[PDB]
RNA sequence: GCGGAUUUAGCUCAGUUGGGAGAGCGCCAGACUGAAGAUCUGGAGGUCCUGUGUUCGAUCCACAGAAUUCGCACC
RNA sequence: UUUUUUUUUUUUUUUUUUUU
RNA sequence: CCGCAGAAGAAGCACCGGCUAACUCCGUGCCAGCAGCCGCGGUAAUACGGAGGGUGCAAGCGUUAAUCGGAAUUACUGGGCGUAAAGCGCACGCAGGCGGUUUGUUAAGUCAGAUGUGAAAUCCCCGGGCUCAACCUGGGAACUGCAUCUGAUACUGGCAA
RNA sequence: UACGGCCGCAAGGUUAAAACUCAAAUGAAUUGACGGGGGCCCGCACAAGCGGUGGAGCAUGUGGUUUAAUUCGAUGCAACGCGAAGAACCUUACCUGGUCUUGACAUCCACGGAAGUUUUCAGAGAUGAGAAUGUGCCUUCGGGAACCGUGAGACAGGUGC
């Protein structure tokens, strides 16, 4: 009956930031404003292998962009011509340069997010994804974790249908600010209305 | 849960209570139009519905509903009788399939097909 | 009166590799199973314990093309008969006239073969029995008549069945086109993928 | 390769001081295809957790039913408070025409020729309890032949 | 071949052969009230089945047509 | 097994679809 | 049956909840209305009432007058007495039901048989004649009882002890 | 429970029939209704007691007077000084009148513009009619900036519970 972030409340304790930067008194507004826009652009570039962690550092307002994706080799490009492009279009909004750094998602099966991006991809096939939903969780759980609970709310049937389903492939200590746990999301549609999946990945105890 | 109160109405929504007294033979019959009425103030403001009485030999007096469209259902006629006492009607315990004789019933209602017996329109 | 089509609409619910149209291009690539054959509810349909036998009466009713008439009038005597539901019923629909001629290859589709047999192009030992519920019992014979015996459609069957599994339960000639059932069909090798007892248990519900 | 099925459930959710309460239950059966059948109950805070706890209990030993070959040779009493109950074998060739209320407990072992529907009660719990507790009371061919020999 | 009565506000019907109308029920409403009722108030509803002519003026009349209906001329 | 500190308090309408 | 001439000449109703079975776009305000057990409508009506499509099936489709279905109930053949309903405060004797159980005996009922009835269309099985489904049928059987007798003895009743 | 009469001193006993009608429940076992129970308690519940609110006058919002005409929702424990902490420019209800329905605010292309300071007369405000004074930065003399335009197609919004 509660949804409860383990993440965000505990930045220094095994759960690092989505952004760590410093603006004084007057200079905060356009930084923050750009912090939605460069994020917007990056994820629609990355979606061909998603983005697990989207890490906006700002060493001097100018932006040390640090992007965890499953396949770097497609945003590197045929070697360097999309790394030019990105660094242009993420500096442009900010008015200041943006140093596009990659990282590789170290096996998508174990991740802070990519368990939700696997299940929400299936809703683009439009057929009965249920055949593949418990499966695609249990696969990723043979390659990592100790428990996971998964929730789907959305338009998942026909004509006027909106209902919500819940599933438990292991136990979940719900908040514990010491544990290795991750909370996260991802969002789909199916020509009728939203399908928004959420996760609690009890990876390990401490 | 005190069954004498509880049984009266409790959770069904068709609620089976129907009161259909009298027998003396069979329900599916011929019924003479005897004497017309349109009298009696009620809550359903029943308009143009001439609800008449029938000379059925059954141990008390009884009445019938007009059973379908077509305004002339005169006092000299003799139609067919059948069950279906809608909540609307006090006293009555039947309705009528009334296009026998000269009383006609459905006029040019193309939609009526197998429900009353009408022919095709312009395909 | 046996339904006529849209014939590939029957495949889009009766399922894969049906006889009704065996032969060319449509098979798999337009009967839309694994794609999404019923697009609107495709997201999360269901079944029923009774419904799943119902689609298998439907299998038998549409793959062989017989009326609700015949389903009752073959079951009528199947309470007198001595074997399983698969013998008593499903075998007969595999060896009624309009079906056995398809099986030997006198037509290319299991919906064409009925039209053929009502057109007086086939006989039973001489009998031009267009009454195509008439069922052809073992070691006595079914032939295309003279003036229809190699007639285009026949060779579009016989040159196309050549690459496929021909059953042993029946035997034919492919160059003068006549034959019979050499034994009774057997619920093992009858090659219909159906659970052959569902279609009489469906009466018990 | 064990076979693992539900049979019955409760809505089980009442008024109190105070608002409403609810629960999740299950009655399940398990088996092993050479002849072995069993049954188990459970509950949880959640739906599949109850089914889980119930099937985990259902996985216990499973009574080797006296089958020779596709079905069984005596009406062994399923004794309960009136169910009565007995089943009737059919002549090994026509199907499991049993009560869909309790058919599960014989299809988890593939018993292919046994019939009888829900005899004296319109409740699947009444018969599914009655059966497993009276199936343990079966006799082998060699036991009925000691009972009528040595 | 007769020609008479009833038809009125959404229903019932008072009563009306010329100055063109009437009560309760039901309907809606200003509040009290989450909405109603207790208490406390407000609005209507039609040119009397209708149409051509009368006539300074129609439900009314002359006159035709509709609905409820009547017994006799009907065979 | 003495258990009267006053008797009464109008109808509604709550009620998150559905096969499992 | 065999050549020309043309797919030519041959179909539709319930309806669409949920029962076997396909759903929505809209209407009128417990209006008008189906009313079988259920269920629908109390300005957001999945089938009331209109319409779009499609469905079950195809000389067919819903539904109706009765009554058993499913459902176990008048129970020699088939039964429930804490329940629906359910050993009636109570038993003076008059008829009636059960009359203690075995020997030597008996076969009327018991049971098996031989022979008669049930010519012909049964029910239940095959073989066939029409092109054939049907239809037209022929062949094979099973009929408790009752008859007339041959037996076999474990009961039912008797006979002597 | 009667409509023939078996008995009874009359009332009734006793057969338990039947006109017709119509839709399921009796039993468990589980509730806990806010509960001057037995019992455990406990809190200005109550104590012992302290200061008072009240009648007349004052600051004041509904009802209700009926005023020309009246704005919501406020009506015990889940509501008080409303939201409004300024209902006479006021974050505008509302009574109105004066403008509009891309409207005040904000874009993507099309042709073009340098941006503003100062009074005079009108007008209730929105807005109307004039008179003077001004001309910036890159500078490919290209493209535009600050920054103002008119003309295109797309196109703007609100405490509604």
Swiss-Prot record, chain A:
Record bears the keyword Phosphoprotein: no
BP GO terms, sorted: cytoplasmic translation; ribosomal small subunit assembly
Ranges of residues in domain KH type-2: 38-106
Domain of life: Bacteria
Record carries keyword Thylakoid: no
Family annotation (InterPro entries): KH_dom, KH_dom-like_a/b, KH_dom_type_2, KH_sf_prok-type, Ribosomal_S3_C_sf, Ribosomal_uS3_bac-typ, Ribosomal_uS3_C, Ribosomal_uS3_CS
SMART domains assigned to the protein according to its UniProt record, in alphabetical order: KH (SM00322)
GO cellular component assignments: cytoplasm; cytosol; cytosolic small ribosomal subunit
Pfam families reported in the protein's UniProt record: KH_2, Ribosomal_S3_C
UniProt xrefs under PANTHER family: 30S/40S RIBOSOMAL PROTEIN S3, SMALL RIBOSOMAL SUBUNIT PROTEIN US3C
Task performed by this protein: Binds the lower part of the 30S subunit head. Binds mRNA in the 70S ribosome, positioning it for translation.
Name under which the protein is recorded: Small ribosomal subunit protein uS3
Swiss-Prot record, chain B:
Modified residues (3-methylthioaspartic acid): 88
GO cellular component: cytoplasm; cytosol; cytosolic small ribosomal subunit; ribosome
GO BP terms in the entry: cytoplasmic translation; Group I intron splicing; maintenance of translational fidelity; positive regulation of RNA splicing; response to antibiotic; RNA folding; translation
GO molecular function: misfolded RNA binding; rRNA binding; structural constituent of ribosome; tRNA binding
Residues annotated with N6-acetyllysine modification: 107
CDD domains from the UniProt entry: Ribosomal_S12
A Pfam match: Ribosom_S12_S23
Gene3D superfamilies membership: Nucleic acid-binding proteins (2.40.50.140)
UniProtKB keywords: Acetylation, Antibiotic resistance, Methylation, Ribonucleoprotein, Ribosomal protein, RNA-binding, rRNA-binding, tRNA-binding
Function comment: With S4 and S5 plays an important role in translational accuracy.
Family per similarity comment: Belongs to the universal ribosomal protein uS12 family.
Note: At least 19 substitutions or deletions in 11 codons can promote streptomycin resistance, dependence or pseudodependence; all but one of the streptomycin resistant mutations (K42R) are associated with hyperaccurate translation and thus reduced translational efficiency. The streptomycin sensitive allele is dominant to resistant alleles.
Assembly and oligomerization: Part of the 30S ribosomal subunit. Contacts proteins S8 and S17. Interacts with ArfA. May interact with IF1 in the 30S initiation complex.
Descriptive protein name: Small ribosomal subunit protein uS12
Curated annotation (Swiss-Prot), chain C:
Domain S4 RNA-binding residues, every copy: 95-155
Pfam family for this entry, one: Ribosomal_S4
Gene3D superfamilies named in the record: Ribosomal Protein S4 Delta 41, Chain A, domain 1, RNA-binding S4 domain
Record keywords, A-Z: Antibiotic resistance, Repressor, Ribonucleoprotein, Ribosomal protein, Ribosome biogenesis, RNA-binding, rRNA-binding, Transcription, Transcription antitermination, Transcription regulation, Transcription termination, Translation regulation
GO BP annotations, alphabetical order: cytoplasmic translation; DNA-templated transcription termination; maintenance of translational fidelity; negative regulation of translational initiation; response to antibiotic; ribosomal small subunit assembly; ribosomal small subunit biogenesis; transcription antitermination
GO cellular component: cytoplasm; cytosol; cytosolic small ribosomal subunit; small ribosomal subunit
SMART domains per record: Ribosomal_S4, S4
Entry GO MF terms: mRNA 5'-UTR binding; mRNA regulatory element binding translation repressor activity; rRNA binding; structural constituent of ribosome
CDD domains: S4
Function (record text): One of two assembly initiator proteins for the 30S subunit, it binds directly to 16S rRNA where it nucleates assembly of the body of the 30S subunit.
Family: Belongs to the universal ribosomal protein uS4 family.
Entries under NCBIfam families matching the protein: PRK05327.1 (NF003717), rpsD_bact (TIGR01017)
Protein name: Small ribosomal subunit protein uS4
UniProt source species: Escherichia coli (strain K12)
Gene: rpsD
UniProtKB/Swiss-Prot annotation, chain D:
InterPro entries: Ribosomal_Su5_D2-typ_SF, Ribosomal_uS5, Ribosomal_uS5_bac-type, Ribosomal_uS5_C, Ribosomal_uS5_N, Ribosomal_uS5_N_CS, Ribsml_uS5_D2-typ_fold_subgr
Keywords per UniProt: Acetylation, Antibiotic resistance, Ribonucleoprotein, Ribosomal protein, RNA-binding, rRNA-binding
GO cellular component, one term: cytoplasm
Domain S5 DRBM: 2-65
Pfam families documented for this protein: Ribosomal_S5, Ribosomal_S5_C
Effect of residue 103 to G: In strain: NEA-314; neamycin resistant
GO biological process per UniProt: cytoplasmic translation; maintenance of translational fidelity; response to antibiotic; ribosomal small subunit assembly; translation
PROSITE patterns (UniProt xref): RIBOSOMAL_S5, S5_DSRBD
Taxonomy, superkingdom: Bacteria
Keyword Ribonucleoprotein attributed: yes
GO terms for MF: rRNA binding; structural constituent of ribosome
Entry-linked SUPFAM superfamilies: dsRNA-binding domain-like, Ribosomal protein S5 domain 2-like
Note: Altered uS5 proteins have been identified in a number of mutants. Some mutations in uS5 have been shown to increase translational error frequencies.
Domain notes: The N-terminal domain interacts with the head of the 30S subunit; the C-terminal domain interacts with the body and contacts protein uS4. The interaction surface between uS4 and uS5 is involved in control of translational fidelity.
Family to which this protein belongs: Belongs to the universal ribosomal protein uS5 family.
Protein name: Small ribosomal subunit protein uS5
């Amino acid at each position: 009956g509660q949804k409860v972030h383990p993440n965000g409340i505990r930045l220094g304790i095994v759960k690092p930031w989505n952004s760590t930067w410093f603006a004084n008194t007057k200079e905060f507004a356009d930084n923050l404003d750009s912090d939605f826009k460069v994020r917007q652009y990056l994820t629609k570039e990355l979606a061909k292998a998603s983005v697990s962690r989207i890490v906006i550092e700002r060493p001097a307002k100018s932006i040390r962009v640090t992007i965890h994706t499953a396949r770097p080799g497609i945003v590197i490009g045929k070697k360097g011509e999309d790394v030019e492009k990105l660094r242009k279009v993420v500096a442009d909004i900010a008015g200041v340069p943006a140093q596009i750094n990659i990282a590789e998602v170290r096996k998508p099966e174990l991740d802070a997010k990519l368990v939700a991006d696997s299940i929400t991809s299936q809703l683009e096939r439009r057929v009965m994804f249920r055949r593949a939903m418990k499966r695609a969780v249990q696969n990723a759980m043979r390659l990592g974790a100790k428990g996971i609970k998964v929730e789907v709310s959305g338009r998942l049937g026909g004509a006027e249908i909106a209902r919500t389903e819940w599933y438990r492939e292991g136990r979940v200590p719900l908040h514990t600010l010491r544990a290795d746990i991750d909370y996260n999301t991802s969002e789909a549609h199916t020509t009728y209305g939203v399908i928004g999946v959420k996760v609690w990945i009890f990876k390990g105890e401490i | 849960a005190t069954v004498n109160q509880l049984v009266r109405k409790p959770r069904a929504r068709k609620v089976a209570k129907s009161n259909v007294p009298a027998l003396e033979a069979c329900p599916q019959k011929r019924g003479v139009c005897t004497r017309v009425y349109t009298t009696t103030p009620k809550k359903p403001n029943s308009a143009l519905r001439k609800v008449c009485r029938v000379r059925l030999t059954n141990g008390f007096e009884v009445t019938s509903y007009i059973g379908g469209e077509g305004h002339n259902l005169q006092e000299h006629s003799v139609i067919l009788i059948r069950g279906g006492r809608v909540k609307d009607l006090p006293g009555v315990r039947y309705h009528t399939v009334r296009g026998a004789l000269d009383c006609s019933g459905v006029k040019d209602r193309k939609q009526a097909r197998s429900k009353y017996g009408v022919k095709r329109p312009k395909a | 009166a046996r339904y006529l089509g849209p014939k590939l609409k029957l495949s889009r619910r009766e399922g894969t590799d049906l006889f009704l149209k065996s032969g060319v291009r449509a098979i798999d690539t337009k009967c839309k199973i694994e794609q999404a054959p019923g697009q609107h509810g495709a997201r999360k349909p269901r079944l029923s314990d009774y419904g799943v036998q119902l689609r298998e009466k439907q299998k038998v009713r549409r793959i062989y093309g017989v009326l609700e008439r015949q389903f009752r009038n073959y079951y009528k005597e199947a309470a007198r008969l001595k074997g399983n539901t698969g013998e008593n019923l499903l075998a007969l629909l595999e060896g009624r006239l309009d079906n056995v001629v398809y099986r030997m290859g006198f037509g290319a589709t299991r919906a064409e073969a009925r039209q053929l047999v009502s057109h007086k192009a086939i006989m039973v030992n001489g009998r031009v029995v267009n009454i195509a519920s008439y069922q052809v019992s073992p070691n006595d014979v079914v032939s295309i008549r003279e003036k229809a015996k190699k007639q285009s459609r026949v060779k579009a069957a016989l040159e196309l069945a050549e690459q496929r599994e021909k059953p042993t339960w029946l035997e034919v000639d492919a160059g003068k086109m006549e034959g019979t059932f050499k034994r009774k069909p057997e619920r093992s090798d009858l090659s219909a993928d159906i659970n052959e007892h569902l279609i009489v248990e469906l009466y018990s519900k | 390769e064990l076979q693992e099925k539900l049979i019955a459930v409760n809505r089980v959710s009442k008024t109190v001081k105070g608002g409403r309460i609810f629960s999740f239950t299950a009655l399940t059966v398990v088996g092993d295809g050479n002849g072995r059948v069993g049954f188990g109950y459970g509950k949880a805070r959640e739906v599949p957790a109850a089914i889980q706890k119930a099937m985990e209990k259902a996985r216990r030993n499973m009574i080797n039913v006296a089958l020779n070959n596709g079905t069984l040779q005596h009406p062994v009493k399923g004794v309960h408070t009136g169910s009565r109950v007995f089943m009737q074998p059919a002549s090994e060739g026509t199907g499991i025409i049993a009560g869909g209320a309790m058919r599960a407990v014989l299809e988890v072992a593939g018993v292919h020729n046994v019939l009888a529907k829900a005899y004296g009660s319109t409740n699947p719990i009444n018969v599914v309890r009655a059966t497993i507790d009276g199936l343990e009371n079966m006799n082998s061919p060699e036991m009925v032949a000691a009972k009528r020999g040595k």
